[PDB]
Enzyme design. Sequence first.
Site, PDB file in Angstrom:
ATOM      1  N   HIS B 119       0.919  -1.128   0.000  1.00 10.70           N
ATOM      2  CA  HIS B 119       0.000   0.000   0.000  1.00 10.70           C
ATOM      3  C   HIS B 119       0.970   1.191   0.000  1.00 10.70           C
ATOM      4  O   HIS B 119       2.080   1.077   0.515  1.00 10.70           O
ATOM      5  CB  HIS B 119      -0.831  -0.030   1.289  1.00 10.70           C
ATOM      6  CG  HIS B 119      -1.805   1.102   1.429  1.00 10.70           C
ATOM      7  ND1 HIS B 119      -1.417   2.385   1.753  1.00 10.70           N
ATOM      8  CD2 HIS B 119      -3.156   1.129   1.344  1.00 10.70           C
ATOM      9  CE1 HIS B 119      -2.487   3.151   1.868  1.00 10.70           C
ATOM     10  NE2 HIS B 119      -3.556   2.412   1.625  1.00 10.70           N
ATOM     11  N   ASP B 196       2.812  -4.523   8.115  1.00 16.16           N
ATOM     12  CA  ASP B 196       1.644  -3.671   7.913  1.00 16.16           C
ATOM     13  C   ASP B 196       0.448  -4.605   8.020  1.00 16.16           C
ATOM     14  O   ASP B 196       0.131  -5.324   7.075  1.00 16.16           O
ATOM     15  CB  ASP B 196       1.705  -3.033   6.525  1.00 16.16           C
ATOM     16  CG  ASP B 196       0.451  -2.252   6.182  1.00 16.16           C
ATOM     17  OD1 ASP B 196      -0.528  -2.307   6.956  1.00 16.16           O
ATOM     18  OD2 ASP B 196       0.448  -1.587   5.122  1.00 16.16           O
ATOM     19  N   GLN B 199      -4.935  -4.947   7.037  1.00 12.56           N
ATOM     20  CA  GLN B 199      -5.965  -5.856   6.537  1.00 12.56           C
ATOM     21  C   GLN B 199      -6.083  -7.155   7.326  1.00 12.56           C
ATOM     22  O   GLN B 199      -7.017  -7.927   7.109  1.00 12.56           O
ATOM     23  CB  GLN B 199      -5.724  -6.189   5.063  1.00 12.56           C
ATOM     24  CG  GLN B 199      -5.967  -5.030   4.120  1.00 12.56           C
ATOM     25  CD  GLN B 199      -7.391  -4.504   4.196  1.00 12.56           C
ATOM     26  OE1 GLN B 199      -8.343  -5.276   4.304  1.00 12.56           O
ATOM     27  NE2 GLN B 199      -7.540  -3.184   4.124  1.00 12.56           N
ATOM     28  N   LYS B 222     -10.747   0.372  10.204  1.00 10.27           N
ATOM     29  CA  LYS B 222     -11.008  -0.863   9.464  1.00 10.27           C
ATOM     30  C   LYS B 222     -11.424  -2.009  10.366  1.00 10.27           C
ATOM     31  O   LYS B 222     -11.829  -3.064   9.876  1.00 10.27           O
ATOM     32  CB  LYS B 222      -9.779  -1.285   8.672  1.00 10.27           C
ATOM     33  CG  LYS B 222      -9.524  -0.382   7.506  1.00 10.27           C
ATOM     34  CD  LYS B 222      -8.214  -0.694   6.867  1.00 10.27           C
ATOM     35  CE  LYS B 222      -7.960   0.254   5.723  1.00 10.27           C
ATOM     36  NZ  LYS B 222      -6.699   0.141   5.408  1.00 10.27           N
ATOM     37  N   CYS B 363      -4.630   2.441  -3.659  1.00  4.93           N
ATOM     38  CA  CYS B 363      -3.349   2.853  -3.099  1.00  4.93           C
ATOM     39  C   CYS B 363      -2.251   1.819  -3.333  1.00  4.93           C
ATOM     40  O   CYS B 363      -1.337   1.677  -2.525  1.00  4.93           O
ATOM     41  CB  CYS B 363      -3.481   3.162  -1.604  1.00  4.93           C
ATOM     42  SG  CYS B 363      -4.458   4.652  -1.262  1.00  4.93           S
TER      43      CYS B 363
HETATM   44  C1  LIG Z   1      -6.221   0.524   4.386  1.00  6.93           C
HETATM   45  C2  LIG Z   1      -4.723   0.252   4.315  1.00  6.93           C
HETATM   46  C3  LIG Z   1      -3.730   1.186   4.902  1.00  6.93           C
HETATM   47  C4  LIG Z   1      -4.204   2.499   5.336  1.00  6.93           C
HETATM   48  O1  LIG Z   1      -3.824   3.155   6.198  1.00  6.93           O
HETATM   49  P1  LIG Z   1      -4.771   4.300   6.751  1.00  6.93           P
HETATM   50  O2  LIG Z   1      -3.739   5.037   7.473  1.00  6.93           O
HETATM   51  O3  LIG Z   1      -5.884   3.778   7.521  1.00  6.93           O
HETATM   52  O4  LIG Z   1      -5.314   5.062   5.565  1.00  6.93           O
HETATM   53  C5  LIG Z   1      -2.307   0.789   4.971  1.00  6.93           C
HETATM   54  N1  LIG Z   1      -1.893  -0.584   4.516  1.00  6.93           N
HETATM   55  C6  LIG Z   1      -2.892  -1.525   4.032  1.00  6.93           C
HETATM   56  C7  LIG Z   1      -2.390  -2.903   3.636  1.00  6.93           C
HETATM   57  C8  LIG Z   1      -4.288  -1.079   3.980  1.00  6.93           C
HETATM   58  O5  LIG Z   1      -5.196  -1.948   3.585  1.00  6.93           O
END
Ligand SMILES: *Cc1c(COP(=O)(O)O)cnc(C)c1O
Lengths: 406, 405
Positions: B119, B196, B199, B222, B363
Amino acid sequence: PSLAATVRQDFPILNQEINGHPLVYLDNAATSQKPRAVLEKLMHYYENDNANVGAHQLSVRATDAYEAVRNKVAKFINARSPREIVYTRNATEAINLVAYSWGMNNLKAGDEIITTVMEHHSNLVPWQMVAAKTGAVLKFVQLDEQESFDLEHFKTLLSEKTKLVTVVHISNTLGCVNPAEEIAQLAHQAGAKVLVDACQSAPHYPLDVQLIDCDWLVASGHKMCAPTGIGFLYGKEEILEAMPPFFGGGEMIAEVFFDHFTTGELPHKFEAGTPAIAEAIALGAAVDYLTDLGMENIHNYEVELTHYLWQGLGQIPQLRLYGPNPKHGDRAALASFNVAGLHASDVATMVDQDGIAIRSGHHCTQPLHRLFDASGSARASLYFYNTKEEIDLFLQSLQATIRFFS
Amino acid sequence: PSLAATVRQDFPILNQEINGHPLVYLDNAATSQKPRAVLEKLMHYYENDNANVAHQLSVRATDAYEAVRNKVAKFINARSPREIVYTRNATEAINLVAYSWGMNNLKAGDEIITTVMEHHSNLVPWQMVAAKTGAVLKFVQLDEQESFDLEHFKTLLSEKTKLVTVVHISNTLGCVNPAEEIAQLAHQAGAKVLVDACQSAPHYPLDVQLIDCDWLVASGHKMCAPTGIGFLYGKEEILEAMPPFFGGGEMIAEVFFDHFTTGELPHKFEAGTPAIAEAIALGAAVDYLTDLGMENIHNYEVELTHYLWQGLGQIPQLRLYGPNPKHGDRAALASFNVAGLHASDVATMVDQDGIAIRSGHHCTQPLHRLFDASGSARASLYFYNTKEEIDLFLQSLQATIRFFS
Ligand SMILES: *Cc1c(COP(=O)(O)O)cnc(C)c1O
Ligand SMILES: CCCCCCCC(=O)O[C@@H]1[C@@H](O)[C@@H](O[C@]2(CO)O[C@H](CO)[C@@H](O)[C@@H]2O)O[C@H](CO)[C@H]1O
Ligand SMILES: *Cc1c(COP(=O)(O)O)cnc(C)c1O
């Protein structure tokens, strides 16, 4: 009916009892209470429109509501463009953004940053971090005879090395209103940039950034009837345009490749990741609520309460009041003080027994307190939903507290 | 009764009509909906306890706020709540590590291994670090099932590998990366590891001690929590050595005119008034999820995932990205493209049937370029979704294909 009388029904938290007595919330400088308009906006969003800001209907609704907030904020402080407004978690983050993006990249060894002895830690520490990394040096404006910003001393600090002037608009301890406009004029003449910490002015005092001509201004939503989690940075477009991005990630980019990324246009440039959507929309509701009342009206009512408060405190012989007396002109609707021979912590704890909520400690201005050998101080801070009757209950509890320790 | 059938009543937003049809929210990977338990927690706080975190209200607000950290620690099995740092979102959490650790521990030539599926939030900060330190980015490629190529990852490891940052579960491909093994290999190579988990935190049981990641990030929005709150997990020893990021009130111990001293963990990294109400709401979100059970949530999502993929795989015009659920366990989502049709038109059309899905690059722009796609359509589920909704989605998708044929 007083302004407070007409709006108190809007704040549900005010209708409750503490230690057997009706709540008297006088710690508004720490954080403000919220009106139903704001809370219902928050609930409505989560119950009907929540979606990321999209092709589907919920996303459209969430996006329209969210995007409408920026101009509400811009108009609230008379910014030239909503592109000059950047959302942050709080004012502290906003100051750090300027320190890291502008400070770390525009200050060199020897450069001078002028601030004041009364600054809140959030408008001091970031600069101490910058100084430590760039070699920049800090100079502090002293207090004058009225325990306020010493304008003449400030003039003596200005030099060829002055590159930044960062000052609080209204002190959360002394309550003095600093001459932001003139400070900016003098700073700009010296060739420096000016940041104004308006956390205590944004909620109580009409703000006009074009008039004070500050280069940046920060404020916290939780102190102006909005939920915690949202604050903002105001920055002259040209300055924000030249400043490099701070946080990197989704939403703040234009294009991303494996080898490089391009930044998005203002203000998105400084907003990385999913925003605090609900909190921002609620802030818009807060701004709408305050504007409906009128900031001049809020200010006029607070001035009345301020005189009443100081007049009452001035009649208690054991008390030492800090900051300029209301009689000399505009000041914050608060009073920081100390009772001879009594620690502020004891004062705060005892009045809480009468349901009165005040604060003791250094209020995040430890250098100021240490400078004048004050072991913290007691502080009663007001907002437009407070009343003269509440001030009287406080004065009575304070007098009783003094008797207890006598 | 399905797991969804037992909880849908808890989410007020699900009970409404869009364009004449009942809402079918299939964009959970973008953001999740909230249960009453969470919203009431938020509302209760503002209507009763709101105060800075010591008069009565302050005490009540402080007790509620302080209790949240251990709920989060327990949720991901962190050794200590001192290892949990609150941020606005996962993106901020990643930037914190990038600026505090990255900018100060990476030198010219040092290598950072990440993946082609990342992302932007777990890519841009590292590109910023690389530009300032001279560090170099390496990218693990996708394997034949469009998942993490562990063999390729092994070839990237070298005496210069200082950091490995990878997504746990891709928000586009839906693949589950072998975090535990990646960490074991990275550590043997002498590198630190960031995962990260944006998800995975909302759908998959997390155990940072088992995975042994050095840092882990997640976004509250989320996982049924309000927007405005997220968190960073960091092994205490590493957070202890890392220099403060934001400076200001609350994160100091003492402040003098000439210097300041930092507070102890986790306060060292939380500057200014926190998102108090929101953190308390995150605590309610964690309790709600824990009550359901992450393993139960996962089991149900797996069921829906096979159903979704079997249905989509049987629509000839579609190109699905990522591993089939029968290739291996994956996320309860599906990114795809309809032959000769732009994803935006697909999303716009199913919305006419009240179906909410996302189009675009999610993204993960670099990733989409590898499939020569400007974007893709993505239907993402959560535990309140049903097989019936999946069927409505499939029917709408088939109808959309007919429209453009
Ligand atoms: C949704 C997403 C993010 C987002 O970060 P936010 O700071 O909540 O916008 C980062 N990495 C992954 C894999 C995501 O799905
Ligand atoms: C709660 C922490 C903040 C405490 C701030 C105290 C500020 C204070 O003591 O500042 C003095 C100010 O009171 C004033 O001092 C006196 C007595 O009031 O007035 C004359 C100058 O007119 C002095 O002789 C005298 O001490 O002025 C001082 C100089 O500007 C200022 O420091
Ligand atoms: C309250 C206060 C701040 C606080 O910033 P937060 O980020 O909201 O904690 C900064 N400056 C002043 C003058 C304040 O009164």
